[PDB]
Paper text:
BRCA2’s BRC repeats bind and disrupt RAD51 and DMC1 filaments, whereas its PhePP motifs bind recombinases and stabilise their nucleoprotein filaments. Whilst Ex14 and Ex27 share an eponymous FxPP motif, their sequences are otherwise divergent, and they demonstrate specificity for DMC1- and RAD51-binding, respectively.
As DMC1 exists in octameric rings, whereas RAD51 forms filaments, we reasoned that DMC1 may be more amenable for structure solution of a BRCA2 PhePP-bound complex. Hence, we established a crystallisation system for the structural core of human DMC1 in which its N-terminal domain was deleted (herein referred to as DMC1 ΔN; amino-acids 83–340).
Residue numbers in the entry:
A (entry chain B), C (entry chain B), E (entry chain B), G (entry chain B): 83 to 272, 285 to 340
B (entry chain A), D (entry chain A), F (entry chain A), H (entry chain A): 82 to 271, 285 to 340
Amino acid sequence: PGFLTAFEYSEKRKMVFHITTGSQEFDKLLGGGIESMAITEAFGEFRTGKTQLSHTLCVTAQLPGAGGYPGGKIIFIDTENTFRPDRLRDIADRFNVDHDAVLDNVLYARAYTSEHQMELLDYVAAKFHEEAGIFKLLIIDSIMALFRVDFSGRGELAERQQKLAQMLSRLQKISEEYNVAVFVTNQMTAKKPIGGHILAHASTTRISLRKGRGELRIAKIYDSPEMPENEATFAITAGGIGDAKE
Amino acid sequence: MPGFLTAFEYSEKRKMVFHITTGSQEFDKLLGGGIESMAITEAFGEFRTGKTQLSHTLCVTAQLPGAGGYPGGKIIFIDTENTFRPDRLRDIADRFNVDHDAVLDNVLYARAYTSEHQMELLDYVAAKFHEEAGIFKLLIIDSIMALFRVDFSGRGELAERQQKLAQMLSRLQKISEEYNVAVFVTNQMTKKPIGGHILAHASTTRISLRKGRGELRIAKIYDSPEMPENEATFAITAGGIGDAKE
Amino acid sequence: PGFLTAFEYSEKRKMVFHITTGSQEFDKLLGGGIESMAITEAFGEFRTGKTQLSHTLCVTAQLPGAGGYPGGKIIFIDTENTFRPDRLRDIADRFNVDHDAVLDNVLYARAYTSEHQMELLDYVAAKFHEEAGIFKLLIIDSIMALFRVDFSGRGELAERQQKLAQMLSRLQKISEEYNVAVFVTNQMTAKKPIGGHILAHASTTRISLRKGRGELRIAKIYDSPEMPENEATFAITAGGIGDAKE
Amino acid sequence: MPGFLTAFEYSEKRKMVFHITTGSQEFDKLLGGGIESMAITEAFGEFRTGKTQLSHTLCVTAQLPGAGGYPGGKIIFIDTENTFRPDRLRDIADRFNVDHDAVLDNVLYARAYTSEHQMELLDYVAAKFHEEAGIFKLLIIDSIMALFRVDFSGRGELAERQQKLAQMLSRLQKISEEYNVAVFVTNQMTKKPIGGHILAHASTTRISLRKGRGELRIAKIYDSPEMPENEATFAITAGGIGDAKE
Amino acid sequence: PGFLTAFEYSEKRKMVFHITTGSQEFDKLLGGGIESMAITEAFGEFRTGKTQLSHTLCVTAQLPGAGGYPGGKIIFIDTENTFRPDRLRDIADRFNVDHDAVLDNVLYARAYTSEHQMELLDYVAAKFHEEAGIFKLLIIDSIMALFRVDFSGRGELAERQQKLAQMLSRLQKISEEYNVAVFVTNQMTAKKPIGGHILAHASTTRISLRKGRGELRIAKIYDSPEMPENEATFAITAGGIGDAKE
Amino acid sequence: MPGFLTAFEYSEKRKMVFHITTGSQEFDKLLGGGIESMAITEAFGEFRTGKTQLSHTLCVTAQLPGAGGYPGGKIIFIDTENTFRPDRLRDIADRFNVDHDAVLDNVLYARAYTSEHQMELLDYVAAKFHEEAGIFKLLIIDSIMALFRVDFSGRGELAERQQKLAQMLSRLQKISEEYNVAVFVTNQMTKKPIGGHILAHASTTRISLRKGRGELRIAKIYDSPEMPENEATFAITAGGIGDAKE
Amino acid sequence: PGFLTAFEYSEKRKMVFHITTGSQEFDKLLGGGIESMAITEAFGEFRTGKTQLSHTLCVTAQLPGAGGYPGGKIIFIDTENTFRPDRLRDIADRFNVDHDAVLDNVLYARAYTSEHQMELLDYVAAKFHEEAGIFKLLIIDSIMALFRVDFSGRGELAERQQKLAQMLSRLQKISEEYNVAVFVTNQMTAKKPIGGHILAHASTTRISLRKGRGELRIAKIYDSPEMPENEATFAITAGGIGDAKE
Amino acid sequence: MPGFLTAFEYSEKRKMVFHITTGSQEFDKLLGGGIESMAITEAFGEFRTGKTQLSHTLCVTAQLPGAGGYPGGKIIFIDTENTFRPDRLRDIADRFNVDHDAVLDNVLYARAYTSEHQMELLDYVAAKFHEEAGIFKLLIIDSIMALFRVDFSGRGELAERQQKLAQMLSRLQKISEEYNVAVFVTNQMTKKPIGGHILAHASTTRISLRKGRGELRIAKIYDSPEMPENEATFAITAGGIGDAKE
């Protein structure tokens, strides 16, 4: 009655996969990469790597990977007007895969309001149902910019939080029922990530991105102790997220 | 009387109270034998303090014959954090020299995505325990009110949050005491544990977990005087909660 | 018309009795012990003697005592999940009375909500009516923990105070109409006892319990001048509330 | 006129005003003879300042022929504090050399458990005085508004508290002045007496009681200049309120 | 149309009279005494002369006086329970007039609520109409103690001010239509007189009373410059308000 | 146009504007001739600054032929302060060598007891002026908004106070400008004059009155720079407002 | 569809004209004078030149001027009761034009309420329609004094701002549809001009007027950098706004 | 999918994105070529920083064939500030050696007088673009939300202001992206730009304009680090926005 045995749940989790970020150290930080049946959130300031990571995953999710990962299709929801297919050209070149094939395997939609964003996710649930195992990654860049927009006054916050919680619980269910990785970007405020308890709870992994030495970037697990193991160095290139020169 | 028992009848009922070993002798002594039936035991602390290791360890130890005539039984696990991992149970089962698949078959598992969902799940749990009493010995809720923080984050709805929270916890008390099961729940901090008077009253035993020297952990009775007897040292391994190797 | 002569009231008060606490000095502090036709409130921190006193009275109320007190039955309402018949075994042993007889003379009920607690007290009024003089003591441990639980927000206090006042006025009437002692425990807050004017007015005697030297305890009349006569020393043993070594 | 008397008619009415001795000559001088009829006299102070001794002493002295042609009469005692004790009246009766049972037969007594109950009782008192005027000489309310504090403790209902309180006190004034009885009431402090403008206006005389040297007490006119004539020393004994033995 | 010529109004004002206070200097301060077609307000602390002045005017208003004043009857409204016909005996003795005659010419009523006080004033308007020129003085001791009583919370002030303004405008109309002096007493608060703008506007003359040397008193025009002409010394005796020894 | 005049038609209307001498040459120079028609002139100040003397003096000077072809006329006086005294007009008439009864016949007088009454009176004034234009030259309101302070003293009704006040003052402006009468009003201070923007806008000229050296007074244009031309010295005598005898 | 080509709009703007202020430097500051198809706002303290400028424009708007300006008629809305045709006599004399002709070309109306002011502007729109090109200037002295009057409390501001915005948008439309200059005066507050964003946006040019040396005045563009080019010196004479002696 | 495109289809759509030169090479480099289509570009700054010169310059440059295959097209200009001046376009057209009347015929222009009017105008714009796509290339809104400040200036209506503002800006985004037009808007500051999160999110590029040395101006990417590449120097001439002559 709404319950599985731990054995049945184990059978379900044996299908969990990781999508490489393109950086070895970053993957190790994540235990292999962006994990399915979970929401992974990346937040930071501008030029920390959020967009490069989103675009890189658009390519790596289509590639055969570790643990028998066969690759698959991607859904990209864009609230920021930042998706640029041309970036995928350089990234696909790096990974030696055809441009048009990469572009044919990414489905894309702009969201202009928070209500629209929620409608899109209902469409996404239907598409994942059409045939499971085809799509492996859902990207939302970004997760709640539109919720700040649509409920900006300090009197409408109750409805904002309710709508946000509803969307995120549906996003959790989507990730876990259909065995897809959900990657989302988020903004910061006076810094801390926005969304409060709701977004903190919904995300299974939260990554703070900041600038490193020169052109290097640093990824860290948010609210984790200040220790090196909880941090990873990566570089940004025309080929996407990658490893430092070394 | 209507709704009253004699102290003798109640004594007969309490003679069947049991404890489930935590895997640590010192922790068990602190608890008077382990996680106690006809009661709610709450464990709270920061990240990597032992909450998840204790939850998973209890999934195995609740199935083993133990002290005080404890015969072992089945477990129900409600997961609000997306943290349950059967593979941890395999390592802990190895430690206790018991079959993996048998351990996994004896744990019923459900994710909760909203506070309303969590309460519905607990109504199903009452039905399951009732189907045949004495089969299930442990109900785990990891965690008890993260979803109430989520669903009632803006103030002005706090009254309804407190009412729903109190209602769930009074039902939990009645479940633990009517069906003689131990209820183990985890909780977050904000440091002091969240939940205020409601959760403080509902729990019969409250445990703060914190990091000790090196890889050791420390369990303490919350709101108790600063004295050694109210504290216990334990260790965390791939085999679960255990004793320090001194 | 709702009035008695002072003579008739005197005839009524001539039946007032005291139930020994088990401690001579404590009894002297109370004028003989826990007094009938009145509410006596004991508050303090943990391990001050509240539970030991409740359990001790479960036995002493059944014993013949000073002033021709013949002993009688007890009703115990438990909001804290702290009643333990096993404690009564040691206390009965101390007073050389049979265990099963002691347990048969105590009626017991858990209250899980404040509304439930009030319903229980309405049942209690009916039971006392069935035959007066059978029951001599009503214990409520504790008096208003559940009222803090059920009305925790700062907007529901009006209804909380009204419900609390209603319960306590009925408790006063129960104690005085049926000539029973009412003993209740209470918590403290930033320390002072909770309940404010309502509980202060309802209780005829209020006792602060605190830790003394070593294992000794101290009982005092709350809000009374700082003088020795208003204080008493007692000890806690397996046999319940008792006198210090001396 | 309609509702008006000539000063002569009012003079004839006031010629029947009487005083009830407090048992203390100095206290009586302070009051102009004792507790005055056609008026409310309020006594307030801390614990063990004399309020209860004065209430009980008046239960006896109101029955004795006295100065100014006072013939003695019966007493009504409304008890909100659970403090009335006929046995005190026996000791005070002994002092004044009068029979116990006669003293007790001449005092009518009722407990009030709510403010609404207290007001209902006062309506019955008006009826009783009316049954045959000149029989009752004293109405005691110990205490006047503890129950109003209880029944309206949260703010927001303060308006209704003040309205009910004012209504009761205007009725009390009319009772004292229409039926030529002295009204004596006790009150708490919070230091200044509670009740604000309403109780200040309703009472014709207000007395603060405080502790003097050793076992002596001091009565003072409230809000009066710091001068000796506005103060009186009295003593408390088993025989009630009396004069200091200097 | 609701207007008189200044000539007709002059004819009306030619009938204005003064009632001596009993003190020569006090009368000079007032231009002859208490003036008709006007409200005169006296405020101060206790034992400043308010009651002595009220009682003195009860006698002097009946005496032939300066400017052809023939004397007349008085109406006394008592909100404070302070009117004492016996004081008039000594005052009448001073002025060598019969006691019973003085008492027969004063009509008296207690007011127990502010609504009652307003009803009484409506009765007074009717009585003055029965035959003008019979009554010369209306005393209200005090003017708004009952309005503070009936509207004590800070939420009912709107209705309080409206009722107070309505009463005072009717009082102005009574004084000016029927050519009677209206004398009222008032309390002070943190000192300043209570009533604010409403009472300040309604009163044509306002008098502050304070204690002078020894048993002397001082009357001053409130809010007037600090100069001797705006002040007068008077004495209080068994014969009422009078002149200093000198 | 509908509701518009040519500047020529308006010029013809303004050619009939007149001034009423204050009795003081220097005051008149300050005002450009005296109290001006088709305008409201407001005078405010403390007690005994000249407001009442000016009001009464104008009652006489408005009846005298004067400078600029002023022919004299009748006066309407609305009295909210109970300060109008025809006998003052007799002394002022003596100064100007005119008959008393003629002066008194030419002043129409009414008391206002409420703000609603004051507004009703002004509607009657509009009717009277209309009965035959050119008869009345001066409308005095002493004072303009004391009764609005009275009738709306508690906040929360301030909106209605401001609306009623604005409505009365716009009617006053229209009365002054439609019927070519001077409107003179007195006002209180709280220092700055009360009435805020509403009264500031409605008045065309505002005069502050204050005490000068010895028995002299000073009139000044409110809110004007500190310069001598904006000030005038005048004297007060039994004959009214006059010039200083230097 | 509600749009013009830039060419058609150019044809419309080619008819834009300027009305000289009477001061050469002031005109240069304005680019020729008061500009049509726009609102020009002048604010300042008293005696800064607002009224002199209004009256001067009443004459100069009728005079042939630079750029082929033929002169025309004027509408003057007066909320302050300050328009004086006699001033125009001296100004017309300066410009050598007949008095009666100047006065016949100015239409005039007083506004007594803000609603009235808005009704007047609706009449004005109709008059401008009767035949375009006849009227060249609309003066409003002042623009929103009556809006402060009619909405003075801090609770009615929403409706005030809405009404003010509505009037000003209609005023913009009037100026631009009928090719007329709109000149308005405004007050200042704690200094800054009143009206906030609404009036700031509606006005195309805003002029601060202040006192200069001796009798000279200074006009500046409000909120512009502190530089000489943004300022102009002018003089005030019986002939209106003019150039300094030099 | 329903509402989704493949990345390839979206790539084909973005291949038609164009840039409109600002007239300044350095400014263009800062913008990646100029004002970009399928996006909103916002420029804000103080007075005389270049906002109006840029708006007018774009009216001409949008009509010229340019880099990246830009063919030129028509412009829609919505004017909330009353600042559009075709004569400026004549000077700028001269600089670029193009006919005046042709330039003016290719700009459609409308004033907005209210925020509701502004939104209605944008609905007409959507219709016009749709009449035949590819004709219009640029929509200018000068300025974007001055009228929203005006129409919702009092707080309490801020919720509705934010909702209307968000709705307009989401429509603007959809207009820019559906019909492949560049949207250029100006904005005020209060220093930081007004509009909060809503306007920050809606604009894809935000430019702060400030004054440089002498007559130079500086354009910067808002909220970007203090670095030279994020800034550009340009000059303002009668010919519009141009490069500095160094």
